[PDB]
Structures are given as structure tokens and as C-alpha cells.
From a paper:
Proline racemase of Trypanosoma cruzi (TcPRAC) is an enzyme present at all stages of the parasite life cycle, contributing to immune escape and persistence of the parasite in the host. Gene over-expression increases virulence, while knockdown appears lethal for T. cruzi. The structure also showed that TcPRAC crystallizes as a homodimer and bears a catalytic site on each subunit.
Residue numbers in the entry:
A (entry chain A): 38 to 394
B (entry chain B): 43 to 398
Amino acid sequence: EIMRFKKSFTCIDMHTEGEAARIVTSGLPHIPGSNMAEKKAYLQENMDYLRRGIMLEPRGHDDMFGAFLFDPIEEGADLGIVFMDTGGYLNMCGHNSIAAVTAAVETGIVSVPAKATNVPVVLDTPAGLVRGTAHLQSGTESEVSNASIINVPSFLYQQDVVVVLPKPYGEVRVDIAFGGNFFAIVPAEQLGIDISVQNLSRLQEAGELLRTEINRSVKVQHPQLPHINTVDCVEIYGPPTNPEANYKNVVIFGNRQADRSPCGTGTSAKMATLYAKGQLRIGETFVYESILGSLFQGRVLGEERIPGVKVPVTKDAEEGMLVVTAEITGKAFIMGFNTMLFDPTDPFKNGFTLKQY
Amino acid sequence: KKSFTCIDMHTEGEAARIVTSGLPHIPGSNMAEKKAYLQENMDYLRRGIMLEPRGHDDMFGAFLFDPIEEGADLGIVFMDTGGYLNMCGHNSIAAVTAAVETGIVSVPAKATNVPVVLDTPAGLVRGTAHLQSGTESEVSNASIINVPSFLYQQDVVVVLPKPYGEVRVDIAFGGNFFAIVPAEQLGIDISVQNLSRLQEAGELLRTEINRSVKVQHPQLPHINTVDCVEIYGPPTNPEANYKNVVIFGNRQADRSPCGTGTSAKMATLYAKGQLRIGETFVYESILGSLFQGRVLGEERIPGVKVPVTKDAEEGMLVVTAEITGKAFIMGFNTMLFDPTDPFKNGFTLKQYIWSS
Ligand SMILES: *[C@H](C(=O)O)[C@@H]1CCCC1=O
Ligand SMILES: *[C@H](C(=O)O)[C@@H]1CCCC1=O
């Protein structure tokens, strides 16, 4: 029995509008690193089989997502966190950050002061500090109605980038923007495919293509964060189905996996792009719809121009790059408490996938 | 604010989410009625536990109940993402295993084998947990004696659209109905890379089959369609006799060798004199896992026949087949359902692919 639970992990399984967040709360040994990005590096280089065992079949599946919690390192942070999926490790994730804020408060990782209606929860992520706020349900001790995250600085990186793709797509114009991860943002109409669950496979294909061509043709580099230097996601957007939504989108990333949520980092990136182009005013509410009909809300809270520091879109005529502080709001639920087990003789203790390449 | 406890298992990669507590009270005077009740009035329980976000498109599981049938230790109803089912070889092995490892049935002092009898919608499934050398209750592997199995109809030729054309299958029962077909007949080599193609070929073949042949379980009217296609070929593992993948539901492949598929395969071979009683048959999966099997005996059912029963036989030939495999516990889970959670009953993004 003592030997059964050797190398086990404990998780709070959650979801944010259908998208998994497997939040691993214990089981890791000490992981060397002086910051969250280094701990993530250590995991990827030395312990990547853990991610595979926790994320993939049979304990997960090809669209599972999660995170390891750590003690916070940065000043003012409550919780350290490293995100993972079926392909690798993202520097940030909006839906998991929303889930983490929700879990922190619902399970007592962070104390709720008496008679409080909002509880802050600051996450120390590999992308930087993410300031969360849990909004409590009126008349409960610590039930969370929904959660806000103030993202790391977001920005438009390169505008009107043409990408050459095989038929039936061809030339597609995209923007490249940072919202925690680098996205390539492309309207669906430029792919010939409208956004629906029926067309998902065509979309997943279209966005694995587009993303490879991008990382071939276009070098990106976060100007304040050396370690962030590829386009991890493709955000395909179109007209809203929901009347409350400005737009619908699906984000394709990793092993051509599709995000079920409206995507928080993606929403930050979209809003930074709209804002840079004068199509969104500061404080205005922006609503993004998912493929499942769920909504995230967002607003741009502040702008800054960073002197002497430039990205491709920054004009010759301008001093510094424009960045924005974007808030994203959504709702997460606890769906289970799990103790995941790994028998040394389990031939699938490190998981498996039947997905091609 | 509902709450279920589960022992999450897998049998050589194939899920078995065994629900041990928290289910509502479900009527029925036998296990088939209990399953009928579940499917007509409580399908939301299955959907919540099997589908995303708590499960996924290839999740599989079972609800434990008090046994009803005399001699049984556990009542059980199986299910997957497509519906509730009557029998499941891999989940039976997992259930036997969990039953002994978590102390649902007793271990006699100094025993090396523990019987666990399951009361399923398809009848009694007599299982045995084989214990590891000197442990309180660590399970080495488990055997199940399937419900009676048989060849049903033989060398059925099937004209499929190209590139397939002519393919010959046998049809057999192992707790579920199967169409057994050589991979070679389809022109596809069995591998992970070819899974998509094998899943299509399974659908196409299955369709033409149910179109061109009606089938009937001559002891129960209702069980009357071929849902599963067992595609087999040369083994990769030298211990194995053959390799196979079972295609079922909606372009779903079984990750395990498939217990009921294995029983059906053995009934087939036996009827063709290709397998002896007591001989050990080893069947490999697409992931390289093995189940072992042995025909324990045969029987004739006087009066009763099926298309293969030759004129003069008086009764169809059935066999009793035993299947053995290993299941692992991969989690102790407590599944939660907020009444305000819009996905409390889960969702799937998987489409039925259809033309016109
Ligand atoms: C969505 C999000 O940030 O919520 C992103 C797209 C893929 C996973 C993500 O981090
Ligand atoms: C395999 C088995 O009996 O283990 C069956 C084929 C389809 C689903 C099953 O359970």
C-alpha cells in the first residue's frame, strides 16, 4: 500500500468551458531552477516522461491539458505554475490560469478574508506574473463564481504577414501577436473553412500547416524574454454565433490539438491586435466565442510604449513598441479529485498516443 | 452536487473506469433490466463519466451493483462513449482485478487464486484473480471464463467499394457479435499508422455485412446485429499466434487484444479444427500487448442451430473459452458534478462522417 502510492501524483481535475485543466498539487520532487521558466526547462529536459504519463492515454487523452503547481518564487506571487499539454509546455495558458485561481480559493490554497467578495491570487508563470482575481458567489464562504486574470503584457508583433501554403489554401495573410504565447491570427474565411465542429479536422489541419510554414519563414523573439521564440499557437477567427460575442475562434496548437475554450492568451493577443489597429478602445468589453458556444470576456486596461525597444510592426517613425495590459474573464469548475498511480511494471506508465506523427 | 468514486483502471492501454460508489438507486430484477433502465432513463450518468471533460472519446467503463443472479459476487453494467453494453472482456478483467486489489471480495487465507463472479447483462462471467507469490492481495493477472461462444456463419464473401472489392469474413459470437476478417483481405497492414484506414474499412465492411446478412442470437432475440469488426494478421511478438484490432462504435478501435474478440476468434479456429481444447492461444494488440486464451470445452445445443450448423448436426456447436490478461490501477478518482456546470453531462466533438 505504501509501495502502491510510490511515484503517485495528486490532482484537482478541472475544466474551463469544457477545456481540461489537470492541476497537479503534489507528487513532484524538488525541481532545480531559480525561476519558473528554468523549472519548466528542467522538466522538459530531464523529466518529460512525467508530462507524458499525466497527459496522455490511458490516464489522459490526446486533448488533455494541465499544470504543475510550485511554491512561488517571485515577490508578491501566491503560487508558482508550469503548464503542460500532450505536445510540450506552454509559457502561459489563460484557461488553466483561470482554473488555477478558482482551485486555489475553492480548495483553500489561498485564504479568503472574512466577508470578502473578491480574492486575489497571483501566479508566477514562465511568461511572467499573472494577477488573478477570484470573484466569490454572494452568500458562500469560498465558492467561486468566476475568475479574472490580468495577463502579462501583450502586443502586436508583425502585421499583414503573407504565408504560402499548399492547396486549397495558398496565400494567407496573418498577424503575429503575443498574449502569453505567440499566436498567428488568421480569419477562417482566408482558409475556405467556416468555423464549426463539423469542420474541425479541416481547421486542425489548416493550422498545423500554417504554423510550420510560419516557424520556418518567420523568426520571432520576445524582446524582454529570451526563452520565448517560436509561434506556439494559431488562432482562427470568424463571425460570432452567440449574439453576445464579437467573434468566434478556435486555437490550434501542439500535436494539432484544438483548444475547447475561447482561449485566454489568444483573447489577449486578439485584443492587443485590435487595439493597435484602433478597432478596440481602452476599457471596452470584448467577448470571444469558442467552438462549443462558450464565452470569455476581456478588456484592455492600459497601454504603454516601451522606448528603445522594437518589434517588426514598430515603425521607423516610432520610439518604442506598444504593449497592452489585458484582462480576461471566464468560469472554471472542479470535476474531480484524483490520485494518479504509476506502477513501475505498467508498460503504459509513461502514456501513449495513437495520433499520427 | 453529485459525487462518484471510481477506480480508474486500464487493461493493456484500454480504459476501465469502474464506478464503486455514489450512483443513484437503479431498479431491475436482473442485470439486463438494470442496463435497460440505465439506457432508457439515466443515460446522463454514462455521458458525464465517459465523455469529455471527465472522460474522452475512447473512455470505457462500468457501474458496480449488488449481484442478483445466484452465485455472483458483483453486478455490473458496461458502457462506452456510444452507449451502455452487455459484455466487455477487458473491463471484466479489470473489475475482477479491482475487486480483489481493493478488497471488494475476500481473500481466503493462503490462497493463490480468488474467484470473482460477475453478474452481467449477458449472463454470469466467472473470473479468477491470480495472486502474486506471497502477497495479501496483489493481483498478477486475471482470467475470465466468457459466456458461451460460437462460430455463427462462415466464409461470408463481401463486395466492398474499391480499393477493397472482394473480402471474405467469418461471423462469430464471444459475448458480442464479430465479423472476423484478415487484414490481408483489406490490403492494409495492421499498425498504428494505418489505424485511420482500418477504422474506415471496419465501417464500410460492417455496413455491407449488416445489409447483406441479418444475424440472430438463437437464445436471445434482441442481440441481433454485428457492431464489431475484428481485423487480424501476422503477429509481431513471437509469443503471439496472431495480432488484431477490433473496430466498433463510431470509428473506435480497441487498444487491447479484446477479450470477447479473442473468445470469438478461438470459437472460429476451434470449429475449423485449428485449435485444440486446452491449447494456449495468444493474441496481440495493435500496441503489442497480449491476452492468453484456452478453449476449455465444447457443447452441443440440441434443436438449436445457426447458418454454419450443418444439416444433421441436431445442435449448434458452442465453446467455453477462458481469457487471461493484466489490468493496472491508474487512479482513485472522485468525480464531481456541479449542478450549474454546463458540461456536467459531458460533450463530444466527434462527428459521424456521412456522404450523399
Ligand atoms: C488558450 C489559453 O491560453 O487559454 C491557449 C491556446 C492553447 C492552450 C493555451 O494556452
Ligand atoms: C473487446 C472485449 O471484449 O474486451 C470488445 C470489443 C468492443 C468493446 C469490447 O469490450
